[PDB]
Ligand binder design. Structure first.
Ligand SMILES: C=CC1=C(C)[C@@H](Cc2[nH]c(/C=C3N=C(/C=C4\NC(=O)[C@H](C)[C@H]4CC)C(C)=C\3CCC(=O)O)c(CCC(=O)O)c2C)NC1=O
Ligand SMILES: C=CC1=C(C)[C@@H](Cc2[nH]c(/C=C3N=C(/C=C4\NC(=O)[C@H](C)[C@H]4CC)C(C)=C\3CCC(=O)O)c(CCC(=O)O)c2C)NC1=O
Ligand SMILES: C=CC1=C(C)[C@@H](Cc2[nH]c(/C=C3N=C(/C=C4\NC(=O)[C@H](C)[C@H]4CC)C(C)=C\3CCC(=O)O)c(CCC(=O)O)c2C)NC1=O
Ligand SMILES: C=CC1=C(C)[C@@H](Cc2[nH]c(/C=C3N=C(/C=C4\NC(=O)[C@H](C)[C@H]4CC)C(C)=C\3CCC(=O)O)c(CCC(=O)O)c2C)NC1=O
Ligand SMILES: C=CC1=C(C)[C@@H](Cc2[nH]c(/C=C3N=C(/C=C4\NC(=O)[C@H](C)[C@H]4CC)C(C)=C\3CCC(=O)O)c(CCC(=O)O)c2C)NC1=O
Ligand SMILES: C=CC1=C(C)[C@@H](Cc2[nH]c(/C=C3N=C(/C=C4\NC(=O)[C@H](C)[C@H]4CC)C(C)=C\3CCC(=O)O)c(CCC(=O)O)c2C)NC1=O
Ligand SMILES: C=CC1=C(C)[C@@H](Cc2[nH]c(/C=C3N=C(/C=C4\NC(=O)[C@H](C)[C@H]4CC)C(C)=C\3CCC(=O)O)c(CCC(=O)O)c2C)NC1=O
Ligand SMILES: C=CC1=C(C)[C@@H](Cc2[nH]c(/C=C3N=C(/C=C4\NC(=O)[C@H](C)[C@H]4CC)C(C)=C\3CCC(=O)O)c(CCC(=O)O)c2C)NC1=O
Ligand SMILES: C=CC1=C(C)[C@@H](Cc2[nH]c(/C=C3N=C(/C=C4\NC(=O)[C@H](C)[C@H]4CC)C(C)=C\3CCC(=O)O)c(CCC(=O)O)c2C)NC1=O
Ligand SMILES: CCC1=C(C)/C(=C/C2=NC(=C\c3[nH]c(/C=C4\NC(=O)[C@H](C)[C@H]4CC)c(C)c3CCC(=O)O)/C(CCC(=O)O)=C2C)NC1=O
Ligand SMILES: CCC1=C(C)/C(=C/C2=NC(=C\c3[nH]c(/C=C4\NC(=O)[C@H](C)[C@H]4CC)c(C)c3CCC(=O)O)/C(CCC(=O)O)=C2C)NC1=O
Ligand SMILES: CCC1=C(C)/C(=C/C2=NC(=C\c3[nH]c(/C=C4\NC(=O)[C@H](C)[C@H]4CC)c(C)c3CCC(=O)O)/C(CCC(=O)O)=C2C)NC1=O
Ligand SMILES: CCC1=C(C)/C(=C/C2=NC(=C\c3[nH]c(/C=C4\NC(=O)[C@H](C)[C@H]4CC)c(C)c3CCC(=O)O)/C(CCC(=O)O)=C2C)NC1=O
Lengths: 172, 285, 164, 162, 177, 324, 164
């Protein structure tokens, strides 16, 4: 895997170039955010059990056929594996948020997830609804203050929303 | 420095401010360089020819090139020395005809193609509407370009993959009355209480139907299970105080010819609204 | 989707050429016509539950035989699926005014419909009587403007001619 | 690639857990040191050609047989001289990559993995590249903690060569 | 193949939602900035022959081992195919700029282009550099910063269109990698 | 775009998006004298179909300038032009003279008929025409059997139909179609399973065994495997590809079996450490950790989630999962 | 004959469908963009005798070696056929403005040209160099209107990319 600092280095080694003066000034801004990025990863991780469970609770209220006999989440092994997957996706979205690059997200979670759910019969349109419910529980948790100093984080919540949309289109 | 309208505009340093085609040479410090070029190559006696790029040529200059003209003052020197030509002297536009070559002040030699009224100097084009101005004293000809004469021998050091590839940031578009609903689902259900089912949204009206059976948010409230033993008697009140009112006094709105009735029977759950509720009013209890 | 963009791109892809001057001239028609057909798509998207339910019982006001035994409007589930299937068709007309062509109606509503409404024995003249009621309910200055109602009705009788 | 960011992700993904404050502090310390490292990398980039021409000449002064002996391994001809100023620029570019990333990651993936195999095969001496690196440690002109970050990755490559 | 308007339709169809209100304003902005998009697609297809030849020549000038015996662009049959491999890639990028969505570029061009280039033996580092040269040419004609041509436009800013078409060219390098 | 959901479509995002959009139907018996642009499009469309999206240069396109002119007034395009272009040297050089007989036989099924050979008897009926009468009648049996006038109007261009259900083929022929047609930016010179020299469906087209379909543009889209016998009788060798059967006690212990195909295995990235290992780089015996990339596994269901993490954490790319 | 009308009628015929609402919208763009190009073509009509004379001198100025004995511009008779062959290209772009697309260039001027010129030993770069001159002497608010110059330039670059 490689983060956002290692991303521009790998793009520059393949050209055989030193980094520019403009490119160092663009990596100073990524360090200048710095603490605001670590606030989003702190808020998402600290409420990780309640984000997964209460957005599984709201999925079975709107699609109650998934827990009927003959549904894809009806049994204890088949329900516990469903909550386990929703915690796997929230894990690698927080990994992609601390790194600034969606490379650990697809190389270790997403590549082969569509092929897995097509061999098992898991409804892929219902997985993306569970992904989109953890999204707006987390982008509403991102832009509340709650012991953070007041400022503008609207550029880092568009990046966190883009990692949830990436995980949702790799399964739908 | 001073105002350009002093001494008329007869001064050489103030004339190009007056003939306002090249305003970038005084907005930047480029006019110090071309005065230092003709010191350095002794062009003050013999006649020559300049091709000044206009305003708009400086504006269409690329951001991967305009950065490299700031971090390298040697690159600004020979680019401005690449516009001063000493082949034909004070040459007009009619002597720039055919195809041929031209010797710059510093750089190798640059080929021109001049075909009638369109004249190219090699990645440049002379706009001939204002280009035949000749100064008598310190004598040269000045013509106007629309692009800088950029030789390819200078700019193999530049590229767009340095970091000048343009990127726009996209931000999320959520409304503040919607993510205030969604913060209550982040807490666990022992401390979030009733707010733990806040993530379910409004389904369409057929999704609560008997094939699909989507559960409303009110099934998770205690207001669905309000089934008491006690009951109001309604006969112990004064006559005229018990009020009742029907929904519509019509046979055809209470029940249509199909069973899609909003008021009678089990099809009262098939409303397009009334899927979610306001239980972020109270408490996290 | 069959659209204005996807038509002129596919025509210049089968010929193997760049977007010509006549392929940019078609997208300019998509600009001058978008004002009328986005007014109809916004008027429909705000008042859709009242337009669907007004047309859902215009089926059963013309065909009261559908509540007879064995028919398609017997019980509560079958009228829930009937008001759903009308709301599906009104969503696809909202999608066609947004895109600008008959794309979403063709791929999602019309293709395969003759083989389903005959296998399941749903009378296709009753998936029409709700669509034909909405086309004559529209008052041309009251709900939308003049050219917004031209676009709204032209996608409404494309669906009628595709079920007939 | 070894980075303070990616080593925190890899030690939590190996255990299979979420990023705790054990991992949020290892990337907080990368952000404190990043200001010294980014000034050390902007200065080594802007004075690269001075440091490349000088360090190659500093090897020809200590080992003058490398400009004398015939053969393909030595910088006798103009072709072996051009392949030496290319090798110094590879060692210098990996140092500025390690300052930008924040760890000894880009010079692990690109330079020091397989380095003892390509030196023994093409018959290059690691003592040539040490003296080329002792020059850059003595001539970058940096000061303080800016020089502490630059000399930490220069001293890392001298330990693999020796 | 989806355009910009039919992309928000397949996003609304996933949740049985009508398109209206919040989503129609981002599409009414597409119509209002729509004259710029036709005025920018015209700038690329007017120079589409000089762009391709200069991209394959500049790929060769920096890496002149490609025209040696053993290089991939050696003979005349191979050079004429490399001049046509890039003329198609530029054609599909100009479709995605006209549509406003990268679905025609991913469906018809990039899906399968990777295993095309590993069966033939095309060097992916050299083909990325030929795309990179086309990226710099496309931003220069859109933002009028071309040093060899000066196209006439109305006055205004089109940075969002240049940052859009730059993201289409980076999908080409990420696919074949 | 990939997937099956989000658009209510599976075949256009399986590589067939360009092919599901054209007709190219030649609506008039002769080309009109005066105009060339309509019929130049049909000739470029029947070059792209019959040659399988190959590059015909201008010095080679002038070698078929005669037929192109017989078609413009006095020949059909389905018959008599695709038949004339199949007897040319440009078709014969790259589709017949390069491969064995059974390799040339299924390239003609794709190019002329738009499908794949179903079983051995589809191969065997076409090799018998070549053994008795030569190449000139061998390409006529693709045109002059019953199938060709049945499925194509004799003024349209052929199109791909081996995936459809009205082309009454076996379901192993569906999986074989997506081995020979990989999207619209590919030819059979640009196919990794036939590189204009191989037999693309050699064991699989004869025995009618089905393959796992990998979509073009997927993550593990570069997955290819070799072929080797395994038994003592045929003098085979063990340990190259995983089996396709799941026979014994391990088939149903740990649940239902699957067959997983991995693509990219490199030397950097094995350990739990985010970076390469510095040092020796190879053990004594000098071999890699994975001597082949493109490995395959047969795994149970209770071992599928530990294996999934063991693949991706070590650099691999899951190409396909298929229940045995 | 590629036009905006011809592209949608041929695409409705290829799918066997009637003219939809996605097809009449493309004819609307032909109406809006018509006033731009139809007065550029009026400008090219009455002033073609001087535009080809100016463009004719602009290729013998660049390639003065054509007047050598043994080249394509030896005598007055071979010179007269070059001013004729550039007057044809100015008539075929006058046709492309009133049609609305690259039809009349693709049939009578471009298809077949690169084998006529190769066989008859005529350099295509000099048939280019007179087309790129009238693209360059055109300044947009003097010679025509601001939008007529966009259409007039759009066909000259289409002719240039075809020869080059
Ligand atoms: C190891 C654990 C660790 C953390 C969790 C963070 C925590 C943290 N955040 C900030 C500092 C900050 N944090 C934020 C972030 C926000 N403010 C808001 O109103 C938004 C809701 C939210 C963005 C999503 C902002 C905006 C600042 C800077 C205050 C300012 O400049 O206005 C600071 C002080 C630095 C400063 O003041 O500049 C610290 C220590 N840093 C750490 O080292
Ligand atoms: C632990 C102890 C405990 C209680 C005391 C009750 C308290 C209580 N009552 C209501 C909810 C309510 N409570 C009332 C009651 C009244 N309104 C009147 O006009 C009368 C004065 C009064 C009855 C005598 C009504 C009418 C509602 C429904 C409110 C509404 O949604 O309209 C709710 C909201 C939850 C729900 O709607 O189900 C709660 C927590 N519940 C508890 O769990
Ligand atoms: C996105 C596009 C889209 C559509 C247009 C519909 C099309 C459609 N409608 C129905 C299904 C139906 N349509 C009706 C309709 C009626 N009953 C009557 O008495 C009248 C004839 C009429 C009301 C207008 C009924 C009753 C069913 C259910 C059939 C059944 O219950 O067997 C079905 C069968 C599947 C099901 O059970 O829902 C389908 C595919 N579905 C779609 O996905
Ligand atoms: C989105 C799609 C859409 C439509 C197709 C129309 C359709 C429509 N019309 C009416 C409602 C009505 N429509 C009319 C008709 C008319 N009124 C006049 O002044 C004219 C003379 C005449 C035009 C023919 C009348 C008189 C009513 C009120 C009576 C009724 O309930 O139908 C209603 C009920 C809601 C209401 O207006 O109270 C609807 C949905 N409106 C829409 O929003
Ligand atoms: C729809 C999209 C689409 C494409 C992108 C191309 C993709 C493509 N390119 C080539 C074929 C080729 N592509 C290249 C290109 C290159 N080699 C290099 O060294 C350069 C890096 C690069 C030029 C930029 C070359 C040289 C060949 C020919 C290889 C050969 O002839 O052996 C072929 C095989 C041609 C054949 O089989 O006859 C295909 C299908 N074709 C398409 O239909
Ligand atoms: C080895 C030999 C060699 C070459 C052939 C050129 C090739 C070349 N051209 C450009 C760069 C460019 N190329 C063009 C294209 C054009 N400009 C015009 O004046 C014409 C209208 C049109 C086709 C001729 C444009 C517009 C740019 C960017 C800026 C500009 O020149 O105005 C770039 C930079 C790409 C980048 O930034 O990464 C390169 C390498 N350079 C070389 O070193
Ligand atoms: C009618 C069909 C049609 C064409 C023939 C072409 C031509 C064209 N371009 C623009 C108009 C424009 N074109 C641009 C684009 C640019 N300007 C710049 O300074 C950049 C260099 C470049 C890319 C960012 C801009 C900024 C406008 C102004 C109008 C607007 O902002 O929408 C207009 C609108 C001007 C008017 O209203 O008259 C037209 C007609 N585009 C079309 O839509
Ligand atoms: C109606 C559409 C139409 C056209 C577009 C042209 C195209 C065209 N031009 C020429 C023909 C020609 N084109 C040139 C041109 C040149 N020679 C030079 O010295 C310069 C290189 C260049 C000046 C522009 C000459 C000299 C001929 C005549 C060839 C000859 O005499 O051998 C011919 C051969 C027949 C002839 O005219 O003799 C044709 C078909 N003619 C058409 O009928
Ligand atoms: C329809 C076809 C058509 C063209 C291709 C052009 C071509 C053209 N330009 C000029 C004539 C001219 N063209 C210009 C050029 C310009 N003037 C300016 O104000 C701008 C700065 C600049 C635009 C580049 C000038 C200054 C003259 C007069 C001098 C001359 O060239 O004789 C003439 C002679 C007639 C005249 O205008 O006096 C012609 C035919 N005009 C046309 O009608
Ligand atoms: C790299 C980390 C990783 C990933 C990505 C992963 C995917 C994965 N998901 C699985 C199952 C599953 N995934 C789901 C999930 C769902 N089904 C639904 O109905 C819902 C819509 C949805 C979630 C709420 C279910 C129900 C199963 C069990 C399927 C079965 O047992 O048949 C299995 C089968 C093994 C098992 O857990 O029993 C794997 C390997 N496993 C991993 O270790
Ligand atoms: C980015 C990581 C990286 C490193 C470290 C690297 C080293 C490297 N240096 C090499 C050669 C060389 N290195 C030298 C350098 C020297 N010899 C002298 O006499 C001087 C004392 C000294 C330089 C100061 C010479 C002369 C050769 C050519 C040797 C040959 O061709 O046999 C070669 C042989 C391949 C080739 O010919 O290019 C490699 C792989 N390559 C890499 O890609
Ligand atoms: C679920 C338990 C199970 C089954 C069903 C099974 C079948 C099985 N039979 C095999 C071979 C074999 N099977 C036969 C059997 C025969 N050949 C003949 O000519 C006769 C007609 C026939 C029996 C009389 C032979 C000779 C081989 C060795 C094949 C060879 O080496 O070429 C092999 C290949 C492995 C090996 O060579 O040992 C398998 C997997 N193995 C199992 O573990
Ligand atoms: C069973 C005995 C055996 C074979 C046959 C074998 C081949 C083999 N060669 C490999 C890589 C390689 N092979 C080359 C070879 C070359 N590249 C070039 O440009 C040259 C033309 C050419 C030789 C000079 C390179 C550069 C790699 C590394 C590719 C990479 O890791 O990205 C790899 C990938 C894993 C690794 O990095 O070691 C394998 C498995 N491994 C084995 O254990």
């Amino acid at each position: 895997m490689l983060d956002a600092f290692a991303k521009v280095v790998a793009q520059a080694d393949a050209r055989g170039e030193f980094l520019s003066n403009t490119q160092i000034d663009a990596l100073s801004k990524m360090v200048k955010e710095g603490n605001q990025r670590l606030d989003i990863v702190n808020k998402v991780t600290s409420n990780a059990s309640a984000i997964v469970t209460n957005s599984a609770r709201a999925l079975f209220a709107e699609q109650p056929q998934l827990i009927q006999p003959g549904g894809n989440a009806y049994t204890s092994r088949r329900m516990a594996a469903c909550l386990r997957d929703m915690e796997i996706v929230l894990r690698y979205v927080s990994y992609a948020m601390i790194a600034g690059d969606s490379s650990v997200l697809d190389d270790r979670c997403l590549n082969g997830l569509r092929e897995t759910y097509q061999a098992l019969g898991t409804p892929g349109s219902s997985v993306a609804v569970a992904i989109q419910k953890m999204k707006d529980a987390s982008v509403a948790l991102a832009n509340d203050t709650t012991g953070t100093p007041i400022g503008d984080c609207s550029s880092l919540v568009a990046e966190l929303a883009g990692y949830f949309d990436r995980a949702a289109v790799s399964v739908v | 420095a001073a105002k350009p309208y002093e001494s008329g505009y007869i001064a050489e340093d103030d004339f190009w401010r007056g003939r306002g085609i090249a305003a970038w040479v005084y907005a930047t410090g480029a006019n110090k360089v071309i005065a230092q070029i003709v010191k350095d190559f002794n062009l003050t006696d013999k006649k020559f020819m300049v091709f000044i790029p206009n305003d708009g040529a400086f504006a269409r200059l690329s951001p991967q090139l305009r950065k490299a003209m700031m971090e390298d003052s040697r690159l600004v020197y020979d680019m401005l020395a690449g516009h001063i030509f000493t082949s034909k002297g004070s040459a007009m536009l009619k002597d720039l005809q055919g195809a041929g070559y031209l010797q710059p002040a510093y750089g190798e030699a640059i080929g021109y193609v001049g075909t009638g009224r369109v004249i190219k100097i090699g990645n440049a084009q002379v706009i001939p509407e204002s280009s035949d101005i000749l100064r008598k004293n310190l004598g040269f000809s000045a013509h106007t370009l629309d692009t800088f004469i950029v030789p390819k021998a200078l700019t193999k050091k530049v590229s767009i993959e340095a970091g000048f590839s343009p990127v726009t940031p996209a931000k999320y578009v959520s409304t503040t009355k919607a993510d205030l609903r969604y913060v209550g689902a982040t807490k666990p259900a022992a401390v979030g209480g009733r707010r733990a089912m806040n993530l379910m949204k409004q389904q369409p009206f057929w999704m609560y139907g008997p094939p699909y059976n989507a559960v409303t948010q009110d099934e998770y409230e205690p207001i669905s299970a309000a089934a008491p033993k006690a009951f109001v008697d309604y006969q112990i009140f004064a006559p005229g105080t018990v009020k009742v009112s029907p929904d519509s006094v019509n046979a055809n709105e209470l029940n249509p010819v199909s069973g899609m009735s909003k008021y009678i029977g089990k099809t009262q759950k098939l409303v397009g609204d009334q899927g979610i509720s306001d239980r972020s009013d109270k408490l996290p209890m | 989707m069959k659209s204005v963009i996807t038509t002129v791109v596919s025509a210049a892809d089968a010929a193997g050429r760049f977007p010509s001057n006549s392929d940019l001239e078609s997208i300019q028609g998509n600009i001058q016509r978008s004002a009328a057909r986005l007014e109809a798509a916004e008027k429909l998207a705000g008042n859709h539950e009242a337009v669907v339910k007004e047309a859902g019982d215009a089926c059963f006001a013309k065909y009261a035989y559908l509540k007879n035994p064995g028919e398609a409007g017997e019980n509560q589930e079958k009228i829930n699926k009937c008001y759903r299937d009308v709301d599906h068709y009104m969503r696809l007309v909202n999608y066609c005014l947004v895109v600008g062509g008959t794309g979403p109606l063709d791929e999602w509503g019309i293709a395969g419909a003759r083989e389903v409404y005959r296998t399941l024995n749903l009378p296709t003249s009753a998936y029409v009587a709700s669509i034909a009621y909405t086309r004559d309910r529209l008052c041309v200055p009251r709900d939308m403007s003049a050219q917004a109602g031209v676009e709204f009705s032209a996608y409404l009788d494309y669906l009628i001619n595709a079920l007939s | 690639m070894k980075t303070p960011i990616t080593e925190a992700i890899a030690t939590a993904d190996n255990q299979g857990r979420f990023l705790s404050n054990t991992e949020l502090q290892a990337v907080n310390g990368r952000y404190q040191r990043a200001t010294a490292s980014l000034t050390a990398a902007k200065a080594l980039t802007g004075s690269a050609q001075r440091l490349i021409t000088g360090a190659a000449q500093a090897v020809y002064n200590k080992f003058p047989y490398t400009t004398q002996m015939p053969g393909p391994a030595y910088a006798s001809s103009a072709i072996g001289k051009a392949k030496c100023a290319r090798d110094i620029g590879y060692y210098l570019r990996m140092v500025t990559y390690c300052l930008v990333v924040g760890g000894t990651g880009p010079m692990d993936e690109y330079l020091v993995a397989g380095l003892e195999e390509i030196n023994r095969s093409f018959d290059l001496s690691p003592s040539w590249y040490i003296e080329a690196l002792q020059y850059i440690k003595n001539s970058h002109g940096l000061s303080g903690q800016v020089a502490n970050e630059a000399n930490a990755y220069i001293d890392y490559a001298i330990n693999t060569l020796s | 193949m989806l355009d910009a308007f039919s992309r928000v339709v397949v996003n609304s169809d996933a949740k049985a939602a009508y398109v209206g209100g919040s989503d129609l304003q981002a599409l009414k902005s597409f119509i209002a900035d729509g004259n710029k998009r036709l005025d920018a697609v015209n700038s690329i297809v007017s120079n589409a022959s000089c762009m391709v030849s200069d991209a394959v020549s500049g790929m060769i000038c920096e890496n002149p081992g490609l025209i040696s015996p053993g290089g991939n662009c050696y003979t005349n049959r191979r050079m004429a195919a490399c001049l046509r491999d890039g003329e198609i890639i530029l054609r599909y990028v100009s479709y995605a700029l006209l549509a406003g969505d990268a679905s025609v570029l991913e469906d018809r061009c990039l899906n399968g282009l990777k295993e095309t280039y590993i069966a033939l033996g095309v060097p992916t580092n050299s083909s990325i550099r030929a795309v990179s040269i086309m990226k710099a040419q496309a931003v220069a004609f859109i933002t009028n910063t071309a040093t060899e041509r000066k196209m006439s436009f109305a006055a205004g800013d089109c940075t969002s269109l240049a940052s859009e078409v730059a993201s289409y060219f980076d999908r080409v390098g990420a696919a074949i990698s | 775009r990939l997937g099956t959901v989000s658009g209510n479509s599976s075949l256009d995002k399986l590589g067939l998006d360009k092919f599901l959009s054209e007709s190219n139907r030649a609506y008039t018996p002769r080309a009109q004298p005066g105009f060339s642009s309509e019929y130049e499009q049909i000739i470029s469309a029947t070059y792209k179909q019959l040659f399988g999206n190959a590059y015909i240069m201008d010095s080679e396109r002038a070698e078929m300038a005669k037929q192109e002119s017989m078609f413009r007034d006095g020949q059909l395009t389905l018959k008599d032009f695709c038949r004339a272009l199949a007897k040319t040297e440009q078709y014969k050089k790259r589709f017949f003279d390069s491969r064995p007989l059974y390799g040339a036989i299924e390239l003609n099924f794709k190019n002329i008929l738009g499908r794949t050979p179903d079983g051995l008897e589809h191969y065997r009926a076409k090799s018998a025409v070549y053994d008795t009468k030569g190449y000139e009648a061998f390409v006529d049996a693709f045109f002059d059997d019953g199938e060709y006038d049945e499925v194509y109007d004799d003024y349209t261009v052929p199109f791909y139909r081996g995936y459809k259900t009205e082309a009454n083929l076996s379901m192993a022929a569906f999986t074989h179609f997506f081995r020979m047609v990989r999207g619209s930016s590919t030819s059979d010179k640009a196919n990794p399973n036939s590189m204009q020299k191989d037999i693309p469906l050699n064991y699989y087209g004869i025995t009618k065994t089905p393959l796992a379909v990998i979509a073009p543009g997927a993550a593990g889209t570069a997955y290819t495997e070799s072929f080797a016998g395994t038994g003592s009788w045929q003098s085979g060798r063990a340990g190259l590809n995983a089996a396709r059967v799941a026979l014994g006690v391990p088939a149903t212990a740990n649940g239902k079996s699957f067959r997983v195909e991995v693509t990219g295995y490199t030397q950097p990235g094995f350990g739990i450490t985010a970076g390469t290992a510095v040092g020796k780089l190879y053990k004594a015996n000098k071999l890699s950790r994975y001597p082949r990339s493109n490995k395959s596994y047969v795994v149970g269901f209770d071992e599928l989630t530990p294996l999934y993490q063991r693949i991706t954490k070590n650099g691999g790319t899951i190409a396909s999962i298929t229940p045995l």
